[PDB]
């Protein structure tokens, strides 16, 4: 269907079980046009991709093994070269990114 928003950070996932998931978007926002009903935009998008973020994350984008912290407010912190938001990139003993930033991790890579 039609994703009722271009980007979204605070992306909530309904507990429901259809395929694909049905998601809701929080985001602070301003009553621009604010969708089909507003309190945030209370319109549920039902699809594979809940949208990209509005502001990138150290993890760059995807991350298959991203540690976490469900509670408030750590909310997690997860290749080759790191990404523009990263900040402590470094190879390791094997061949020739950990960031303090929090927030709901996006999807995985594989």
């Amino acid at each position: 269907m039609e994703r009722p928003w271009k980007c979204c950070d605070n992306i909530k996932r309904l507990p429901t079980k259809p395929d694909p998931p049905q998601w809701r978007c929080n985001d602070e926002l301003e009553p621009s046009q604010c969708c089909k009903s507003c309190r945030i935009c209370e319109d549920i998008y039902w699809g594979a991709d809940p949208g990209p973020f509005c502001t990138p994350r150290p993890w760059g984008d995807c991350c298959d093994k991203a540690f976490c912290n469900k509670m408030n407010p750590p909310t997690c912190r997860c290749v080759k070269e790191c990404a523009d938001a990263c900040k402590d990139c470094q190879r390791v003993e094997s061949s020739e990114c950990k960031d303090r930033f929090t927030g709901h991790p996006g999807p995985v890579c594989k």
Binding site: L14, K17, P18, D19, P20, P21
Partner: protein, 223 residues
């Protein structure tokens, strides 16, 4: 369905696939030209599929029947999910053989401890993804309305009812929504929601079909 086993080409004759390009929801045929499903599974342009084994393959034992009309439920509320039910009418009404059969409505909400048969085409990997071609099956008892709440603090209601295994690892999952939760000839449950899939102290949640007994008579009598 996570933790289940393969059912067997039509063994759950009342099980249907709510389709619209792809399979997104369950559905248990309650009779001739009707189908019971989930509230949230509502959409515009349903094509109900009956008598299927592999959903991604035709096997001439299937019946594609569009959706004459797709009703929903009054109190149904998207936020709490309480009242999760939809009613679907078939532009027609199938043949009703061995493979494609009708389930039967309850008379009285089954008690806890009851082993029920939950089934669908959803995901079979809790943490991950592995959507099956053939319909999967799961045997699961009802938890006490006491314990249900014990896991989902202030979220259950006179309709939704947990079912599954508190220890987890076996449960209904993404794809299964609008599925049947039968317990001895009785279509007692409807796949509704849950935090994740098959995770300790996070059982599933299916709506009480027994509390809409009347509701249906009406909705079919009319519409």
């Amino acid at each position: 369905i996570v933790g289940g086993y393969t059912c067997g080409a039509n063994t759950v004759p009342y099980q249907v696939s709510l389709n619209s390009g792809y399979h997104f929801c369950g559905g248990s045929l309650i009779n001739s030209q009707w189908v019971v499903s989930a509230a949230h599974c509502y959409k515009s342009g349903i094509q109900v599929r009956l008598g299927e084994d592999n959903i991604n393959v035709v096997e001439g034992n299937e019946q594609f029947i569009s959706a004459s009309k797709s009703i929903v439920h009054p109190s149904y509320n998207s936020n709490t999910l309480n009242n999760d039910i939809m009613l679907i009418k078939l532009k027609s009404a199938a043949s009703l053989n061995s493979r494609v059969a009708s389930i039967s409505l309850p008379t009285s909400c089954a008690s806890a401890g009851t082993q029920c048969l939950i089934s669908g085409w959803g995901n079979t990997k809790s943490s991950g993804t592995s959507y099956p071609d053939v319909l999967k099956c799961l045997k699961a008892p009802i938890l006490s309305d006491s314990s249900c709440k014990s896991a989902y603090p202030g979220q259950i209601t006179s309709n939704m009812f947990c079912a599954g295994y508190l220890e987890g690892g076996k449960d209904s999952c993404q794809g299964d929504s609008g599925g049947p939760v039968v317990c001895s000839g009785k279509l007692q449950g409807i796949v509704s929601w849950g935090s994740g899939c098959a995770q300790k102290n996070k059982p599933g949640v299916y709506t009480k079909v027994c509390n809409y007994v009347s509701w249906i008579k009406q909705t079919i009598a009319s519409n």
